[model samples]
Target: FACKTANGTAIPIGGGSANVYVNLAPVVNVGQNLVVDLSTQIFCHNDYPETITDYVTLQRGSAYGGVLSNFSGTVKYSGSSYPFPTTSETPRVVYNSRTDKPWPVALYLTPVSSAGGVAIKAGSLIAVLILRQTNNYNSDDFQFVWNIYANNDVVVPT
Candidate 1:
């Protein structure tokens, strides 16, 4: 089970944002469906002016473009409405891990808020990696923690 952000369309600084991806450990191989189980959060700060919508974008190369795959569900902020808040503040974005060869994929957080001043904060990012099934191939698998502010122009905390 490996994880990462693939190709995505490049936008101007502060043009968009990305939320930290959350999920249970995944382990799959070719001919298997990528079942992604996510649990993460998307925060808003002063200067953000839109609703944040998050999704996983898969691509062949940089820019998060090419062939794209995503989860078909709705994401919401952490609050007292839902009974289970295990994924709150670092909520879940459950999508199937893919069996296809590992490639560049992204966990994008589109602002869905109607507030002003929103952006990715420092250290706010998702995690990707293989949990089990020790494969000797490709010792350098995709596994890294991305800081929101580092990728996006917005300023916030991880």
Candidate 2:
């Protein structure tokens, strides 16, 4: 989210409680593969000379399994297939400098290894995204906790 000036000016960055934000909801998936489109979910404004960096974390628990293999997505740095490292369950993205308001992304949640074939189980998972302009400067952060049903009916927790 952003703030507006008294003169009704739109400031993408520079003036706000935070310079980054994300809009997300709980996602549901059947026994098939689940893909989360993050193309427009992230919003940010650049004030520093360096590009912004977004750190993402996907966690697996008892109720929710985990990624069978490495997740793949189109990275802004190269605009190609970015294989997310499952070993750490955390990945990052580096966007182009100034005026780049939106960063596009996608994530696929696969099934457990034993039943692998591009499908997930009935449970829940968590996604934590942290935004930052510099290593020392902290920014906005959003957490998305999604549920996976056996019928592909997802719901947002109240």
Candidate 3:
């Protein structure tokens, strides 16, 4: 874990947002299948245990130059897919007009499954997106916002 105090930091083994990444095909062929995965990883260090969560939003550009029709999304944590947690503020996806911008998906790392707040171990999840190319694409088009913080944040929880 190479986490040192700064404006922000991402470690190799310890927890936190590792910066956002955008992946798209420069050119997509018609009738091609385009899959997008927004994955967040959590690795808790024993020396500094703390609760952590990730808020990732994937948005679609108004246009993709061609036609990107029929897009679908699914949320899964640790390889198993679970329904959107109804009790709490959960993830969301949209494909109307049909596209979703800043489509939110999230997860937290915790020592106990029942206590899904404090993080004393490790975890991960993937927001799987599937798109059907109705026409050829001229460029890559997608945006992502990954917001995360550790227990060391200076906002308020001192």
Candidate 4:
């Protein structure tokens, strides 16, 4: 089925000592043949020490899906933008310390059917960026105060 770009709004998600902001789209009706296209960016403020490991999770109601779209990210250090490859099995990004500007992370999502119907339901699709500081402490020792900005969009069938 073909998809069309319709007018819609994206809800902004951020707060507290978080280092990332997510611009998410409000819940919309996804008909039988309709699909939602999520186009957003995860802005990392780099508020931790040394280095940090980041990953994005696409949550639809009670289910989850891998971000299977063209992905890339940019680092403020020396101004570098390169290909950012990620999968369900291995989803992470390493950020070095002293990064001046915010790291622009490109994230996209296009819904598809498996066998019965769409993978997600009619509820809101929450996009979350989980960040952890990598330092010389404990393997599970990490912080959850990074920020993110998600600019989400949707596409419906016409």
In candidate 4, what are the lDDT values of residues 1-158, reduced to their tens digit?
00111121211223223323343333322322222222222233333333333322221111123222211121121122222222221234444433322333333333333222222222333333333333333243333322232334333221
Model 3 misplacement above 4 A? 1-19, 28-33, 39-70, 82-158
Candidate 2 lDDT (Cα, whole model)?
Answer: 0.33
Better of 1 and 2 by lDDT: 2
In order, the Cα lDDT scores of the candidates are 0.24, 0.33, 0.24, 0.28
Q: Please report the candidate that would top TM-score against the real structure.
A: 2
How would you encode candidate 1's per-residue C-alpha lDDT over 4-49 as one tens digit per residue?
A: 2322222222223233333322322222232222222222121111
- Residue pairs in candidate 3 whose N, alpha carbon or C atoms collide under 3 angstroms: 59-102
Q: Which ten residues in a row have the lowest lDDT in candidate 1?
A: 59-68
Rank the candidate models, highest TM-score first. 2, 4, 3, 1
Give candidate 4 regions above 4 Å deviation.
1-41, 45-97, 100-104, 113-125, 137-140, 145-153
Worst 10 residues of 4 by lDDT: 1-10
1-158, model 2: which lDDT tens digit per residue?
A: 22222123233332222212222223433344445444444444445535335333333211222332322222221243444422222345444445435534444543333332323323234232222233224554333322222222233221
Ranked candidates, highest lDDT first: 2, 4, 1, 3
lDDT of 3 at 98: 21
